Design an enzyme around this catalytic site. Structure first.
Site, PDB file in Angstrom:
ATOM      1  N   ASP A  28      -0.170   5.188   0.705  1.00 12.08           N
ATOM      2  CA  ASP A  28      -0.487   6.208   1.702  1.00 12.08           C
ATOM      3  C   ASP A  28      -0.677   5.597   3.073  1.00 12.08           C
ATOM      4  O   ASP A  28      -1.545   4.741   3.275  1.00 12.08           O
ATOM      5  CB  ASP A  28      -1.749   6.963   1.323  1.00 12.08           C
ATOM      6  CG  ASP A  28      -1.605   7.711   0.029  1.00 12.08           C
ATOM      7  OD1 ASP A  28      -0.767   8.639  -0.034  1.00 12.08           O
ATOM      8  OD2 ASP A  28      -2.293   7.437  -0.976  1.00 12.08           O
ATOM      9  N   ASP A  66       0.872  -1.154   0.000  1.00 12.17           N
ATOM     10  CA  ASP A  66       0.000   0.000   0.000  1.00 12.17           C
ATOM     11  C   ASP A  66       0.916   1.212   0.000  1.00 12.17           C
ATOM     12  O   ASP A  66       2.092   1.095   0.352  1.00 12.17           O
ATOM     13  CB  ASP A  66      -0.850  -0.057   1.260  1.00 12.17           C
ATOM     14  CG  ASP A  66      -1.710   1.142   1.455  1.00 12.17           C
ATOM     15  OD1 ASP A  66      -2.396   1.588   0.508  1.00 12.17           O
ATOM     16  OD2 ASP A  66      -1.785   1.690   2.564  1.00 12.17           O
TER      17      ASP A  66
HETATM   18 CA   LIG Z   1      -3.401   3.360   3.202  1.00 14.59          CA
END
Ligand SMILES: [Ca+2]
Ligand SMILES: [Ca+2]
Ligand SMILES: [Ca+2]
Ligand SMILES: [Ca+2]
EC number: 3.1.3.68
Lengths: 218, 218
Positions: free
Chosen positions: A11, A9
């Site tokens: 962010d 992932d």
């Molecule tokens: Ca995230």
């Protein structure tokens, strides 16, 4: 289960961008006359695509002038400037990516953020070379917790989704990886620490500094 | 969260078909020369579409003659005959569906099983009139835990998936509903009792006889 790839992932997992997205959203919404004090009226939005958050605000407090999509692209641009400016690489990232290669894995990125931002953040930390594939949920009908972005990433990687381990910081992201039938490692955001739903993950880490080969491969 | 529709899982939720599917798979696999005693080699398949299960067996012990798809069709046909024969309506079903209507909800069905089987089971219990929409994952690229079938059902119903409550008996089915961003009630299969991952559901019932208006609407 044989693991051939690790998908990260972006962010809140690779970069500490959640505070920066908040600031971008705040600034833009304020400029539109939106009463921000009513933030508590929105549901938990951790891991949701920006377009969904702007829609949520617009449903509570419509505004005139820029469309929701024009607002989306203003928030995006601002968040990106904030990322470039602060370079918020999270602890253990470089080591975690290296470990993936040490353990024989392909490396992917799967994010709700635009592909151009994905390219930008990776290139700015000299990590672009380590990633074998990137997948953005921007053009897709549904972002996380829908699995499409993770399935797209697995396909660009050239492996069965079942052979992937997804590293996530949010429940929505975790659900996306599990709806894709992948192995899951979570490094919960501060905003989500004691969420009981992380019991779905195969491994829970307090930090990526703690990542081991056993966590990746099972 | 305003609830406008209830979508029921089929197998193991409305009908006690899981043991019938087991018998159908066993009988067909045995006829192919497949060594059944090694059933322990496969992962948990609860709530997975039959094709995935046939592929799992074929990966362990590849047979000759009928293709995997021909084997899938044979298992489906056998399972259907077993359901017609035993008519295994689970407790609380008719009352649960009636409750949904009394609470002002549209009623959907979302299942990995073929559409013709969905029509058959509903018609067999004089329940077809109560269902406003049926959605099968048979033709989709991915069944539960992919949310597509639930999203298709919501679309056929004419409502936002966010306004749907999905009733499921399995973790795989629950994850599908949560990947569609729906409210979740689970009535865990006997096999799935004590699965910690049901903490993701909004409501957990020991039986559909326990279903209340508050469980549906929140
Ligand atoms: Ca995230
Ligand atoms: Ca190695
Ligand atoms: Ca590099
Ligand atoms: Ca089921």
């Amino acid at each position: 289960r044989q693991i051939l790839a690790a998908i990260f992932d972006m962010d809140g997992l690779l970069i500490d961008s959640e505070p920066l997205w908040d600031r971008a959203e705040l600034d833009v919404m304020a400029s539109l006359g939106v009463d921000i004090s009513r933030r508590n009226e929105l549901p938990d939005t951790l891991g949701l695509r920006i377009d969904m958050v702007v829609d949520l605000w617009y449903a509570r407090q419509p505004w005139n002038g820029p469309s929701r999509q024009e607002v989306v692209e203003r928030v995006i641009a601002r968040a990106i400037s904030l990322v470039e400016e602060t370079r918020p690489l999270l602890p253990g990232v470089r080591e975690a990516v290296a470990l993936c290669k040490e353990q024989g894995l392909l490396v992917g990125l799967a994010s709700a953020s635009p592909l151009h931002m994905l390219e930008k953040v990776l290139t700015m930390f000299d990590l672009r070379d380590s990633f074998d594939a990137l997948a953005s949920a921007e053009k897709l009908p549904y972002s996380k917790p829908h699995p499409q972005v993770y399935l797209d990433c697995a396909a660009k990687l050239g492996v069965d989704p079942l052979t992937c381990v997804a590293l996530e910081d949010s429940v929505n992201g975790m659900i996306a990886s599990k709806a894709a039938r992948m192995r899951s490692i979570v490094v919960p955001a501060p905003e989500a620490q004691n969420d009981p739903r992380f019991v779905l993950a195969n491994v829970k880490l307090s930090s990526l500094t703690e990542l081991t080969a056993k966590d990746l491969l099972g």
